[PDB]
Symmetry: C2
Subunit: 130 residues, 2 copies
């Protein structure tokens, strides 16, 4: 609801914030759109995060995370197509690998991790145990 | 877009229709909401299917399938929560197991398969290869 802007501040009992957000050198590069959830009949509960992986083309490649009381769900968007992804350390490392490698003196490496993540994207399958 | 109603008719080059829809004894029990996709700048392309697994409580437990030119995506909804699921024969059998076991002389068996599918639901994880 109310959407703050900076994490370099108050603490949060959310993993996306401790595991990924807080370790991004330049959080602003990525247009962090971050609403906080509560005031709806409830009162201070979840966090709703959106990062642009390609801030040159809004919404071309985005990362969203919805965190609540108990659960968290993760999503990736590439070219209009959304896919949920398991929130884990594998995804986190891939996320920071991309987020923390921007550096104009090494575009090649950064773009390398970006293309690696799209690869991951097309890989996601949603499965159950039968 | 234009939403037909009956499959006991024309043929379709879509798996949801050949593998699941066409094998449901009483397709109407489940409020098949089925739009056909095309006329949008395109022209005859996809099929958009929605089945109510609990037709007593609209949208409490639903199954949706979006089929297009090449791909198909599958979704399950239980109590407001949506989760994509891999479209395969495992899901199909689970689907018909539920859809084809309605029978007032054996509510117990039917309800048995319904509860088994909710179980499956909470099991779905979305994973990539790293
Ligand atoms: Cu970049
Ligand atoms: Cu039933």
């Amino acid at each position: 609801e109310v959407n703050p802007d900076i994490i370099k501040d108050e603490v949060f009992d959310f993993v996306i914030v401790n595991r990924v957000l807080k370790k991004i050198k330049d959080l602003k590069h990525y247009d962090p759109m971050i609403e906080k959830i509560f005031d709806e009949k409830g009162k201070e509960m979840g966090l709703n995060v959106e990062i642009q992986i390609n801030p040159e083309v809004k919404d071309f490649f985005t990362f969203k995370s919805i965190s609540t009381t108990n659960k968290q769900r993760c999503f990736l968007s590439l070219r209009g197509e959304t896919r949920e992804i398991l929130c884990d350390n594998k995804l986190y490392n891939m996320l920071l690998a991309v987020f923390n490698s921007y550096d104009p003196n090494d575009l090649l490496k950064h773009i390398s991790t970006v293309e690696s993540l799209k690869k991951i994207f097309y890989t996601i399958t949603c499965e159950a145990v039968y």
